RNA sequence: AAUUGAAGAGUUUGAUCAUGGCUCAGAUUGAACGCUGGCGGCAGGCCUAACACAUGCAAGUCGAACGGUAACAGGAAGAAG
């Protein structure tokens, strides 16, 4: 149950006396399938180097999120830089409908049946990230009782 | 049981993030045109000039309201084919 997938691979340019020196960047997401998900970025002069150098970063850099069986407990909003993301429980019929790129984090995460949309820029590096922190801030469908009960 | 349902992509930059317009995937149509074209079922068919219109047809019916016979039908004292 490794389960991983890269979301966006891109090229960039550095520019020096001798001209442009190009490079690449991968952005990836690994999840266990039962909560626990992280993303990694990582960049390198050539693509395979970078997509791999990324996968690892994600293995570390990994949060975990309090699911509720196949779905989220309540609805949540996430918002990093220019991306404002919103995703919702959805008493699954099928579900998992969302902006491929946050479908990525959502399935490896293990959510099985949510609807989402991304507002603002769909800049991958900031959505997959806005959603993570999104799922992250999410909270205990029980241990709000922790907070209260008391 | 009976609205229990939401995706994003391309494009300013050497490159970047943002701002932002343009653009695309969708569905829908009383449609036209180019190419092509076998059959059926249900449907639709002047969106323009409330422009103008030849011709037929689109409102008649009742003799159980009435005087009635001109048509075609029988029939009639009776005049006969
Ligand atoms: Mg970093
Ligand atoms: Mg260019
Ligand atoms: Mg033809």
Swiss-Prot record:
One GO cellular component, as annotated: cytosolic small ribosomal subunit
Classification via Pfam families: Ribosomal_S5, Ribosomal_S5_C
Entry keyword annotation includes RNA-binding: yes
Limits of the S5 DRBM domain: 2-65
Recorded consequence of changing residue 12 to E: In strain: SPCR7; spectinomycin resistant. Not a ram mutation
Biological process, per Gene Ontology: cytoplasmic translation; maintenance of translational fidelity; response to antibiotic; ribosomal small subunit assembly; translation
GO molecular function: rRNA binding; structural constituent of ribosome
Keywords, ordered alphabetically: Acetylation, Antibiotic resistance, Ribonucleoprotein, Ribosomal protein, RNA-binding, rRNA-binding
Keyword Glycosyltransferase in record: no
UniProt xrefs under InterPro entries: Ribosomal_Su5_D2-typ_SF (IPR020568), Ribosomal_uS5 (IPR000851), Ribosomal_uS5_bac-type (IPR005712), Ribosomal_uS5_C (IPR005324), Ribosomal_uS5_N (IPR013810), Ribosomal_uS5_N_CS (IPR018192), Ribsml_uS5_D2-typ_fold_subgr (IPR014721)
Signal peptide positions (record): none
Function field: With uS4 and uS12 plays an important role in translational accuracy. Many suppressors of streptomycin-dependent mutants of protein uS12 are found in this protein, some but not all of which decrease translational accuracy (ram, ribosomal ambiguity mutations).
Subunit structure of this chain's protein: Part of the 30S ribosomal subunit. Contacts proteins uS4 and uS8. With proteins uS4 and uS5 encircles the mRNA as it enters the ribosome, which may play a role in mRNA helicase processivity. Can be cross-linked to mRNA. In collided ribosomes contacts ribosome rescue factor SmrB.
Family label: Belongs to the universal ribosomal protein uS5 family.
Notes concerning its domains: The N-terminal domain interacts with the head of the 30S subunit; the C-terminal domain interacts with the body and contacts protein uS4. The interaction surface between uS4 and uS5 is involved in control of translational fidelity.
Additional note from the record: Altered uS5 proteins have been identified in a number of mutants. Some mutations in uS5 have been shown to increase translational error frequencies.
Name listed for the protein in its UniProt record: Small ribosomal subunit protein uS5
Species assigned in the record: Escherichia coli (strain K12)
């Amino acid at each position: 149950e490794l389960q991983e997938k890269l979301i966006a691979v891109n090229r960039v340019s550095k520019t020096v006396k001798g001209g442009r020196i190009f490079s690449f960047t991968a952005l990836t997401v690994v999840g266990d399938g039962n909560g626990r998900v992280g993303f990694g970025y990582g960049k390198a002069r050539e693509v395979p180097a970078a997509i791999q150098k990324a996968m690892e970063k994600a293995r570390r850099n990994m949060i975990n999120v309090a699911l509720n069986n196949g779905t989220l407990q309540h609805p949540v909003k996430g918002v990093h830089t220019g991306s404002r993301v919103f995703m919702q429980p959805a008493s699954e019929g099928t579900g998992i409908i969302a902006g491929g790129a946050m479908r990525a984090v959502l399935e490896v995460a293990g959510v099985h049946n949510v609807l989402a949309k991304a507002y603002g820029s769909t800049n991958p590096i900031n959505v997959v990230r806005a959603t993570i922190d999104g799922l992250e801030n999410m909270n205990s469908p029980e241990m709000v009782a922790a907070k209260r009960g008391k």
